[PDB]
Amino acid sequence: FTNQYQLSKTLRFGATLKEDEKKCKSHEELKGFVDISYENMKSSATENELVKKCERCYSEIVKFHNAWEKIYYRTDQIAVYKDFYRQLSRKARFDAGKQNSQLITLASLCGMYQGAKLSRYITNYWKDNITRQKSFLKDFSQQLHQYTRALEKSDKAHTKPNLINFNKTFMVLANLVNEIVIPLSNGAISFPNISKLEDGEESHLIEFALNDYSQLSELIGELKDAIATNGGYTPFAKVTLNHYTAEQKPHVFKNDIDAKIRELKLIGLVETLKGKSSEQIEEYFSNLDKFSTYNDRNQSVIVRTQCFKYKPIPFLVKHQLAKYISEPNGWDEDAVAKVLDAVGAIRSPAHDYANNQEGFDLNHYPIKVAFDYAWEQLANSLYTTVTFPQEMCEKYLNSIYGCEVSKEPVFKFYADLLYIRKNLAVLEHKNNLPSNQEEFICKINNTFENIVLPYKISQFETYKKDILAWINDGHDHKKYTDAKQQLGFIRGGLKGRINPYTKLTNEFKQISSTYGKTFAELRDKFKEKNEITKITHFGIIIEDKNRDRYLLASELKHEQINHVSTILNKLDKSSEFITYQVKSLTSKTLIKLIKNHTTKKGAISPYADFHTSKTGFNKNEIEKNWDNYKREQVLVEYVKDCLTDSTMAKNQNWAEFGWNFEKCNSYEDIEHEIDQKSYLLQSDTISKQSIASLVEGGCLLLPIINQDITSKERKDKNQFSKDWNHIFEGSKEFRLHPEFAVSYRTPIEGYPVQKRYGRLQFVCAFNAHIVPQNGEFINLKKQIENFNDEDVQKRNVTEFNKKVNHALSDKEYVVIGIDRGLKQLATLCVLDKRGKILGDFEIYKKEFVRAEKRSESHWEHTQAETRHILDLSNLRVETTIEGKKVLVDQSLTLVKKNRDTPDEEATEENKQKIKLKQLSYIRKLQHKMQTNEQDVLDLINNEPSDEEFKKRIEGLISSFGEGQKYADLPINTMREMISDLQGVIARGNNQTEKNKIIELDAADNLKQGIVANMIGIVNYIFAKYSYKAYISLEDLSRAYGGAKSGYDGRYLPSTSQDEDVDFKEQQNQMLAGLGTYQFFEMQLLKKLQKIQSDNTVLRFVPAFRSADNYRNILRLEETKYKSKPFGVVHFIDPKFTSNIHYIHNGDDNGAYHIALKSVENLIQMK
RNA sequence: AUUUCUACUAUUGUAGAUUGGAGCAACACCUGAAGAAGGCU
RNA sequence: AGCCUUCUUCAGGUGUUGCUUUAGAAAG
């Protein structure tokens, strides 16, 4: 059950020292330097205003771009620092050589390197930078003037560009400008020869040199931090712990980019559309057979998309991709750009039939577009004359459905409901009421009385009665409005309920998903080309005598000195502060070293240390034919000798990695051995004065903080702190990835400094890798290949649980069967392998004890019940003060009404499904607050009492679906939100202040934590039975019937009506977003693949990433029940689930039967 | 009180859970608009 | 001319669901 897969694990750590009086002081030996560096980090940490700022920035970067384009080639003026010149040697790909000056004027570099001037490489790099930022300035100019035109003309508000592509275009443009302007603001590009008096003819350079580009840099950084801030966290730095990974150059995704364009068949699509006019591409897409192309799996997904719905290629990827594929094919870039632009051009059949009528055809338009036009304009035709091609729309709908549409009951019912809505709209037109309303009343009555119901609707007659009563006599407006809203819901959900059309929409789900994934991956890997500086800091972890750990990060652009050597030169062996840094190698680095070696005459490759003088290096065979030369034995032997006896293997001391290539007879074996053994945590020491000189020199001393490692009695209770102190043992199996990103979160106003949101919080997010050292392991990139192919993943699951069932064949296993519902969020039953109901779980309780000494107060746990079939809903694993882990019921201990009231008693309940119920009620109120706003303000009309206010809510909000109807309504929070909405609608009716109230609250965190309690329970039981256990779950993927949505009264279809309907998600929407089925599934399965003992990771379910990896697996056969085994988890069919006397409830029986259905076929199968 | 989430306590914190970043698709509603159709005055 | 409804489209927001990509040293 050992883990054979590589795993990543982000361990986030705070970097802001809390200074509360009730927080233990930590990092005291370097406290002054921590507080100094906090002020350093505080000083550089900060849709119509955004675009005004973008237009201001675009004007400054156009001015800067046009000024820089006339300076960069005047090489007698530019001078570079030595660190900048070396980074230019790496970036412009030449040899630095020997420069014996701190300031290198480009009037030097007249020497030759590989057939060119040395300064010409710098000038050509800057010229390429100018060209790329000019192209991105053109793209950003197009988007910016488009969005500005949409802004300052309220008529044209529908022409806004995509904001994600707008933001990402500015991020690429900001990177490209920043590569030039950051050395200008830092002085790494300076102009020393400006002292001579030539202002009569060279004054334009004088305005360039003394201009403050710090202002432009900070304004661009302001926009970047505005764009990059997601969730309140702004990226601060990207620190490396391995200094060879510093000064990193962007990854080349050439093979990955070319594979997506191959998958898109984009080259062949531009082949059949290049040279066409913009109207001829339109006629090509018009004359395409929509239905045969849409279902043709071998077509382009781009073509298969534009024959169902007009879906244009996104702006950023389309301009990166047009320039990408225009180059090697010799195409004109404008022609391929025109082809890419005309793909997915929106066309309206209604607007086109309005303009002209002859030559019109619904086959010219995509399936959804023409279907919508035909269905809507034919529904209007059954009660009035409509100017549209009536028989053509009939023919189109009959071709789609195979039957005579406008004779079907469903389409007729849609036409009646649309006509009813139209006549109610005319009769409601209060400003322009008709002179003769009687004939509209007659029309409504006639349409309601001649209507025929296609199926059963329970409440339709009530809606009809209320609407007819309102129009005829005027009884009620509330019931009439509710009835009209429900009829609108029915009519909206009726569109296409006649299977031939839901199939096409379900196919478009995957087709548009592949379209979006491929273009998003292409955009992410084309944006990678301009990620010039990934690493900004080089850092070490500094440990002192109290085992506190710091982060001494130093900017790589901070000054003209070498900032990799600055930290490392100050390391000693007998100092007081132990420093750590990662010494590691990967197959990624190896393949970067082998392929990029150069054997040209004038070239001095930077990788000549890595490569020895054997026979195995042949550049053409490595470059053009790598995947065939990697299997040749001469290259394997050459790579082994390059890793053993090269210059780089003795300079970097690669013999300390403990490599052994006596078993590696292949290149994949070499890469695996490198990825397995190559990790050492290089421990050195540094002094107090060295840290003082570095922090005073501008470096940042971020203190690594969490609750456990900065407490008084520093015992590791968290798994992140346990992993943190497992990393610094130097063990190979649990590594520290050298790269990690520091971010910051600005304080929220209205929050005190005693809380983390009223504090500027810096977070270090370390990545820790689990690399199995016992033999062959599967790396992360091999894993994503298996996750992306369902046949490979099916075979992997089959071989994994073949391995598992051999282990637990002749063992005395138990079976852990879990039911899921709403009455109990999960209930668990443990069975013996013969089916005997086990379970002697002691259920404890907490009571807080106030000791005489105040800091010695603690929780004492006492046993309260003995339960056998557990209700996991109110349980959480608790560790007592004696170290024993017990099961504690949260509901047994009351909680206090107001937090931080030590002298008051506890009088409130602590059920978790009550929390879910309250959040669902809040989300239902916020939904009706958006859609039915005045109805929501009517709830507090005359300052109601709580009972009559609850009665008022019961006419607006649906119940939860569990417990009594409106059991635990959050009235004191609901009335506060409605009063806040009344206040916001008063004093100006601002929309953002409304959106802070009316928008739905996220439900994922509450139910994630509530499920995490239960996952801890299941982990405790699984480890209790010595991991020789089986787990059984339902297959809750099929919805046998319909449901009503929690938000509206909307009907949620079954799986029969729509094959993509999942029972868990249908029930989630039934509860207004508070379903805990898939959360329990995903959290249990993500727990079971990483179950961690003292120092070893034990894996009990196969490797998976998505939900289509654990669903859509091979089910076992030749048994009683249909079960899908996923490691130790069996997803049995839920059909007929709901010491035999241990069953007391209706769902204890369900959990016992879920366990028993797995017991039976584990008996039969093995 | 939190790396963060959840539940707490007021114990210089507690217990469980914790892989983070960028997006993509479908849906729901809101907001800003456009097009067409029918219709009202 | 004003105005209402209806369908579709566009942009954003917030949710719900899934789904990918990325996360160690890239010179002909």
CA atoms within a 13 Å half-sphere pointing along the CA-CB vector of A1113:
33
Q: Name residues whose C-beta falls within 8 Å of residue A343's C-beta, 6 or more positions apart in sequence.
A: A269, A273, A281, A285, A302, A306, A312, A313
Residues 907-936 of A with CB under 7 A from strand B: 908, 910, 912, 915, 927, 930-931
Instruction: Name the residues in A1087-1116 having a C-beta closer than 7 Å to nucleic acid strand C.
Output: 1105-1109, 1111
Q: How far apart are CA A348 and CA A1049, in angstroms?
A: 32
Q: Are A895 and A996 in contact (CB under 8 A)?
A: no
Q: In this structure, which amino acid lies at residue A24? A: C
DSSP state of A599: -
Both A56 and A8 in a single domain? no
CA of A409 to C1' of C9 (A): 28
The answer to whether residues A540 and A554 touch, using CB atoms and an 8 Å cutoff, is no
- Per CA to C1' distance, which residue is closest to B8? A895
Residue showing tokens 């390391």: A571
Is A552 inside any structural domain? Answer: yes
Do both A190 and A244 map to the same domain? Answer: no
A485 touches strand B (CB under 7 A): no
DSSP state of A380: G
Residue A317 lies in a domain: yes
In-domain check, residue A1157: no
A760 CB-to-strand B distance under 7 Å: no
A853 touches strand B (CB under 7 A): no
A976 strand C contact, CB < 7 Å: no
Taking the C-alpha atoms of residue A1161 and residue A1123, their distance in angstroms, rounded to an integer, is 9
DSSP H or E stretch at residue A866: strand A858-867
The separation, in Å, between residue A423 CA and nucleotide B36 C1' comes to: 19
The angle subtended at Cα A208 by Cα A204 and Cα A210, nearest 5°, is 120
A711 strand B contact, CB < 7 Å: yes
- A518-CA/C21-C1' distance, Å: 9
Q: Where do the H-state alpha helices sit in A742-841?
A: 780-788, 790-807
| A638 and A615 Cβ atoms separated by less than 8 Å | yes
Q: How many domains does chain A have?
A: 4
Nearest to residue A79, comparing CAs of A109, A103, A110? A103
Tokens linked to A196: 């001579």
- Looking at the structure, tell me whether residues A82 and A218 fall in a common domain: yes
> CB within 8 A of A597, min separation 6: which ones?
A605, A607, A608, A610, A611, A617, A619
Q: Which of residues 6-65 of A touch strand B (CB under 7 A)?
A: 7-10, 12-14, 18, 20-25
Q: Round and report the angstrom distance from CA (A675) to C1' (B18).
A: 26
d(CA A393, CA A371): 8
How far is the C-alpha of A178 from the C-alpha of A531, rounded, in Å? 11
Kindly state whether residue A120 falls inside one of the protein's structural domains.
Answer: yes
Distance (Å) of CA A536 to CA A187, A223, A232, A531, A752: 17, 19, 21, 12, 32
Alpha-carbon torsion A300, A160, A520, A129, what sign?
positive
Phi-psi region of A496 (alpha: psi -120 to 50; beta: other; left: phi over 0): left
Q: How far is the CA of A910 from the C1' of B8 (A)?
A: 9
Strand A858-867: give its sheet, edge to edge. A858-867, A841-849, A885-889, A875-879
A710 touches strand B (CB under 7 A): yes
CA A213 to chain centre: 35
Kindly state whether residue A991 falls inside one of the protein's structural domains.
no
- Residue among A1075, A1080, A1078, A1098 at smallest CA distance from A1016: A1080
Does residue A708 reach within 7 angstroms of strand B, measured from its CB? yes
Cβ–Cβ < 8 Å for A133, A140: no
User: Mutual orientation of helices A478-493 and A409-427 as an angle, nearest 10°?
Assistant: 150
Q: Is the CB of A348 under 7 A from strand B?
A: yes
Report residue A228 as tokens.
Answer: 């990059």
> Is residue A534's beta carbon less than 7 angstroms from any atom in nucleic acid strand C?
no
Structural contact between residues A16 and A762, judged by C-beta atoms closer than 8 angstroms: yes
- Answer whether any strand C atom is within 7 A of the Cβ of A510: no
Q: Which nt is closest to the CA of A93, judged by C1'?
A: C27
Q: Is A995 helix (H, G, I), strand (E, B) or coil?
A: helix
Answer yes or no: is A495 CB < 7 A from strand B. no
Which nucleotides of chain C are near protein (any atom < 7 Å from a CB)?
2-28
Q: Return phi, psi of residue A817, to 5°.
A: -95, 130
- Looking at the DSSP bridge assignments, the partners of residue A859 are A848
- Phi, psi at residue A702, to the nearest 5°? -80, 125
Strand B contact with A356 (CB < 7 A): no
b/e map of A452-474 (b: 16 or more CB within 10 Å)? eeeeeeeebeebbebbbebbeee
The answer on A309 and A238 residing in a single domain is no
Strand B close to A889 by CB, under 7 A: no
Interhelix angle A163-186/A315-326, rounded to 10 degrees, is: 70
Q: Which helix (H) or strand (E) holds A1082?
A: helix A1077-1088
How far apart CA A765 and CA A87 sit, in angstroms, is 27
Which 842-901 positions of A have CB less than 7 A from strand C?
none
Question: The tokens of A955 are what?
Answer: 């006419």
Cα–Cα–Cα angle for A141, A144, A145, rounded to 5 degrees: 85
Binding-site residues of A for Mg(2+), in ranges, read 819, 1034, 1147
Beta bridge partners of A549: A543
Domain boundary among A732, A756, A777: A777
Burial of A47 (0-12, 13-18, 19+ CB in 10 A): exposed
Is residue A894 within 8 A of residue A874, CB to CB? The reply is no
A912 part of a folded domain: no
Largest separation between any pair of C-alpha atoms in chain A: 103
* Residue A442 shares a structural domain with residue A581: no
CA A945 to chain centre: 44
Q: CA(A150)–C1'(C11) in Å?
A: 9
Q: What is the CA radius of gyration of chain A?
A: 34
DSSP class of residue A14 equals E
Residues 157-176 of A, Cβ under 7 A from nucleic strand C: 157-164
CA A554 to C1' C11, in angstroms, rounded, equals: 42
Any alpha helices (H) in A956-1003, and if so which ranges?
Answer: 971-985, 991-998
Question: Can you tell me which residue has its alpha carbon closest to the C1' of nucleotide C17?
Answer: A1065
Residues 764-783/A with CB < 7 A to strand B: 765, 767
Report the binding-site residues of A. 819, 1034, 1147
- Encoded tokens for A63: 């001015």
| A1073 burial type by CB count under 10 A (0-12 exposed, 13-18 middle, 19+ buried) | buried
Mark which of A777, A800, A829 sits at the end of a domain: A777
Do residues A246 and A304 both lie within one domain?
A: no
| Nearest one of A142, A147, A145, A140 to A168, comparing CA atoms | A140
The alpha carbon of A371 is separated from its chain's Cα centroid by a whole number of angstroms, namely: 34
Residue located via tokens 């109601």: A944
Please name the residue that has the structure tokens 């993943």: A793
Alpha-carbon gap, residue A202 to A216, rounded angstroms: 23
Q: Identify whether A343 is part of a domain.
A: yes
Closest residue (Cα, C1') to B39 = A426
Pairing of strands A1029-1034, A814-819: parallel
Positions 664-693 in A, CB within 7 angstroms of strand C: 679
CA distance A127 to A116: 16
Residue whose entry in the numeric block shows the structure tokens 């039953």: A829
Q: Which nucleotide is nearest to A1047 (CA to C1')?
A: B28
Tally of residues, chain A: 1166
Helix (H) or strand (E) holding A1142: none
Distances (CA, A) of A1146 to A840, A1139, A1149: 20, 16, 6
Nearest by Cα to A712 from A594, A568, A864, A546:
A546
Would you give the DSSP letter of residue A1029? Answer: E
CA A194 from centroid of its chain's CA atoms: 50
Between the two ends of chain A, the Cα-to-Cα distance in Å is 18
Please name the nucleotide lying closest to A371, CA to C1': C8
Residue A1122 CA to residue A1115 CA, distance in Å, equals 7
Euclidean distance between CA atoms A1010 and A1013, whole angstroms:
5
Residue pair A339/A281 in contact (Cβ under 8 Å)? The answer is yes
Residue A552 near residue A15 (C-beta atoms within 8 A): no
> Are A456 and A579 within one domain?
no
Contact in structure between A580 and A724 (CB atoms under 8 Å): no
Residue A1152 near residue A1158, CB atoms below 8 Å = no
User: How far is residue A550 from each of residues A26, A556, A557, measured CA to CA in Å?
Assistant: 11, 19, 21
User: Measured at the alpha carbon of residue A823, what is the angle toward residues A817 and A829, in degrees to the nearest 5?
Assistant: 20
Whether A549 and A684 share a structural domain: yes
DSSP letter assigned to residue A703: E
Are A8 and A78 within one domain? no
Q: What share of chain A is helix, strand, coil (3-state, %, to 5)?
A: 50, 15, 40
Could you say which of A754, A777, A800 is where a domain stops? A777
Q: CA A336 – C1' B34 distance (Å)?
A: 29
Measured distance CA(A758)–CA(A114) in Å, rounded: 58
Residue at minimal CA–C1' distance from C10?
Answer: A158
Cα separation, A352 vs A357, whole angstroms: 8
Q: Which residue is nearest to nucleotide C21 (CA to C1')?
A: A521
Is residue A1151 within 8 Å of residue A829, measured between CB atoms?
yes
Strand C reaches within 7 A of the A589 CB: yes
Please answer whether residues A19 and A758 qualify as being in contact, where contact means their C-beta atoms are separated by less than 8 angstroms: no
Cα separation, A75 vs A159, in Å, equals: 45
Which of residues 99-138 of A have CB within 7 Å of strand B?
A: none
3 state SS for A455-510: CCCCCHHHHHHHHHHHHHCCCCCHHHHHHHHHHHHHHHHCCCCCCHHHHHHHHHHH
Q: How many CA atoms lie within 13 A of A93 on its CB side?
A: 9
Residue with tokens 């500027």: A760
DSSP assigned state of A112: B
Strands A841-849 and A885-889: parallel
The identity of residue A758, as a single letter, is G
Residue A258: CB atoms within 10 A of its CB come to 14
Closest nucleotide over all strands to A710 (CA to C1'): B12
Q: CA–C1' distance A159–B35 (Å)?
A: 13
Q: Same structural domain for residues A696 and A733?
A: yes
Closest nucleotide C1' to the C-alpha of A418: C6
Within a domain: residue A182? yes
Range of the domain at A690: 1-20+230-250+534-585+678-777
By C-alpha distance, which of A637, A284, A1158, A995 is closest to A293? Answer: A284
A885 C-beta less than 7 Å away from strand B: yes
Read off the DSSP letter of residue A22.
T
Return phi, psi of residue A814, to 5°. Answer: -125, 165
Q: A989 — alpha (psi -120 to 50), left (phi > 0) or beta?
A: left
- Cβ neighbour number for residue A59 with a 10 Å cutoff: 10
Q: Where are the alpha helices (DSSP H) in A528-618?
A: 565-568, 587-595
Is A1082 within 7 A of strand B by CB distance? Answer: no
Rounded distance, CA A175 to CA A136, Å? 11
What CA–CA distance (Å, rounded) separates A1062 from A1034?
13
DSSP E strand boundaries for A363-422: none
A623 C-beta less than 7 Å away from strand C: yes
Sequence-ordered list of residues with C-beta below 8 angstroms from that of A326, at least 6 positions apart, any chain: A332, A333, A336, A337
CA A526, CA A256: separation in Å to the nearest integer?
A: 10
| A287 lies in the same domain as A436 | no
Q: In this structure, are residues A528 and A248 in contact, taking their beta carbons and an 8 Å threshold?
A: no
Check if residue A486 sits with its Cβ under 7 angstroms from strand B: no
| SS3 per residue for A878-914 | EECCCCCEEEEEHHHCCECCCCCCCCCCCCECCCHHH
**Cα–Cα distance between A334 and A341 in angstroms, integer?**
10
Please give the single-letter amino acid code of residue A680.
Answer: L
Instruction: Give me the amino acid identity at A579.
Output: T
Tell me, yes or no, whether A157 and A72 share the same domain. Answer: yes
List the one residue out of A12, A10, A8 whose CA is nearest residue A745.
Answer: A12
A274-312: b or e for each residue (b if 16 or more CB lie within 10 Å)?
Answer: bebeeeebeeebeebebeeebeeeebbbbbbbbbbbbbb
Which nucleotide minimizes the distance between its C1' and the CA of A1010? B6
For strand B, give the nucleotides within 7 A of a protein CB: 1-41
Note whether A780 and A672 are within 8 A (CB).
no
Q: What gap in Å lies between CA A917 and CA A969, rounded to an integer?
A: 8
A775: Cβ contacts below 8 Å, ≥ 6 apart: A4
Which residue is associated with the tokens 């209930």? A827
- Give φ, ψ of A423 to 5 degrees: -70, -35
CB of A868 closer than 8 Å to CB of A875:
no
Tokens, residue A408: 């079907």
From residue A912, give the alpha-carbon distance in Å to each of A920, A1018, A1142, A1146: 13, 17, 24, 20
In A805-857 the beta strands, taken as DSSP E runs, fall at 814-819, 827-832, 841-849
